[PDB]
Symmetry: C5
Subunit: 25 residues, 5 copies
């Protein structure tokens, strides 16, 4: 489907923002 | 529910972006 | 419907990204 | 429709991320 | 079709965030 990929990409975005916060701190 | 999943991930994204804003400022 | 909440959160995200742009500018 | 606004906001998010990348480069 | 555009923009956002992480590291 496509909503599954949308959710997975949003999860990847959450992970990448977590990593960005880690690197900023 | 898909839509519900998307709202929660976007809320996490908003929280992380607020954290990034306050880490920059 | 959750589409309204999705649009609200995306609008907040746009605002926060503009804030980040301005913070990186000066 | 709300899908058009979602696409528009995502496109603006892409533009803002491009601006962030350009500023960081 | 708007879902294809949404997935495309989300994938581009993921790529840009990966670039931001790779630039911060
Ligand atoms: C905005 C940059 C040009 C790329 C256009 C999107 C191509 C892929 O999406 C097509 C959806 O149908
Ligand atoms: C998903 C790949 C994103 C990596 C960012 C590369 C952007 C480099 O192009 C910038 C061109 O602007 C010229 C600078 O002056």
């Amino acid at each position: 489907d496509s909503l599954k990929w949308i959710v997975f990409l949003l999860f990847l975005i959450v992970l990448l923002l977590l990593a960005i916060v880690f690197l900023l701190r």
